[PDB]
Amino acid sequence: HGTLKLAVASIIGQHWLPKVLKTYVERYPNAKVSLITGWSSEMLKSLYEDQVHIGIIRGNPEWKGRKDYLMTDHLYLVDTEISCIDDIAHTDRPFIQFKSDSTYFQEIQHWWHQKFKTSPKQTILVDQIETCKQMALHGIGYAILPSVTLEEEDKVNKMPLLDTKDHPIGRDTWLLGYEPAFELKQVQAFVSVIKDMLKQ
Amino acid sequence: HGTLKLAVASIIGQHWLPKVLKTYVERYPNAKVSLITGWSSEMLKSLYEDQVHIGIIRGNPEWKGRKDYLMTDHLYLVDTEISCIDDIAHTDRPFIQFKSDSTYFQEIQHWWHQKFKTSPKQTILVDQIETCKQMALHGIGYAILPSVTLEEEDKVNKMPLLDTKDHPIGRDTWLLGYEPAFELKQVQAFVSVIKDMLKQ
């Protein structure tokens, strides 16, 4: 029962993985866990280069190994004052806007263009989603966040992002590895903890 | 006015920078900000390669431009169960350790060797500090965090780390940047806002 090496997308590492690691540690005391985090592209690279056993990756990664769908969450435009999502096309509050090399940024641009037929205000550009949340909780402006980072208790208005046909805009999260990893007892225990937690 | 390109150490970007940025947007509407985060070394290296105007770096960075001391925070051990820091030399409760290329990790090994005359049991190694905090908040184990990441709303016991000679153990945060950037106007209004902030 050796060391489990994980490469996990940042918002997952922050918001979803802790509860999984709690159960993993509860069932397997003193099992060693090594965790790196970051952009999805970076964690995929790490997994591709044999540096970890398992990647948890968002988006739609192409992968010639084992790939398990985990979950989907949906985008919300959050703000402290604005209550109605149509006002966002006129307000003077800045668009705090996450941007990495994933498709998250492009897809919000596409939604904005289609819904409002205008372009959004490239004022504040941030390279990590959690800083967007924080900056938005502090009233600086509004933000578009995946619901995996939101809680009901968050003092901020929650406005569903819907496409032109009123369908919530989603993002997927996958678990990825090559066959040798899945033969390891600690990888298998971790996967088993995950596929337990998904039914909750 | 011009667009301010910041590089901030991750924990600063999340915990300290949002209030600094709120005031800066409050006094300067339509002023654009662009923010990359990460390890101090990575933001130092980016500042050196002219990608940003201003770096907010942690530790003791060597720098041959302008270096403004900013603040000092102190290391706290946190756990949901453990209330006395001497308990940890004897607990099967796991140790959640942040580790990067900065001195942070070896600083803590040194304090531990010098206080408990033993080595800490490495079970959980993670590569970003906020992930340590969350995993500590989730009761998984104890962590050692800088106070800038802590709040009283954080439902964990917080225990100050003191060296062999009764003294709290600190890390500093600086503000670096080459002379030209400080000529630029938005940099001056941001350096300003910071220093007028710090006056409580």
Residue numbers in the entry:
A (entry chain A), B (entry chain C): 90 to 289
What does the primary publication say about this deposited structure?
Finally, we obtained crystals for the IBD of BaCcpC and determined the crystal structure of BaCcpC-IBD in complex with citrate at 2.3 Å resolution using single-wavelength anomalous diffraction (SAD) phasing. The BaCcpC-IBD molecule is composed of two distinct regulatory domains: IBD-I (His90-Arg155 and Gly266-Gln289) and IBD-II (Asp168-Gly259). IBD-II has four β-sheets, which are surrounded by two α-helices and two 310 helices. Both the IBD-I and IBD-II subdomains adopt the typical α/β fold, which is connected by two crossover regions that form a hinge at central regions of two antiparallel β-strands (β4 and β9). Five BaCcpC-IBD molecules are in the asymmetric unit, and each molecule has an RMSD of 0.201–0.275 Å for the 144–180 Cα atoms, which emphasizes the similarity of their conformations. BaCcpC-IBD forms dimers with a head-to-tail arrangement in the asymmetric unit of its crystal structure, and both molecules have essentially the same overall structure. Superposition of two dimeric molecules in the asymmetric unit gives an RMSD of 0.327 Å for 321 Cα. The dimeric interface is stabilized by the main chain interactions Val122-Thr212* (2.82 Å, * denoting the partner molecule), Val122-Leu214* (2.92 Å), Leu124-Asp216* (2.80 Å), and Thr126-Asp216* (3.33 Å) between the β2 strand and β6 strand. The electron density corresponding to citrate molecules is found at the positively charged interface between IBD-I and IBD-II of BaCcpC-IBD. To distinguish between the terminal carboxyl groups, these were named pro-R and pro-S. The pro-R carboxyl group accepts a strong hydrogen bond from the backbone nitrogen atom of Ile100 (average distance for five molecules in the asymmetric unit: 3.12 Å). In addition, the pro-S carboxyl group also has hydrogen bonds from the side-chain NE atoms of Arg147 (2.93 Å) and Arg260 (2.80 Å). The central carboxyl group of citrate accepts hydrogen bonds from the backbone nitrogen atom of Ser129 (2.70 Å), the side-chain hydroxyl group, and Ser189 (2.59 Å) and Ser191 (2.89 Å).
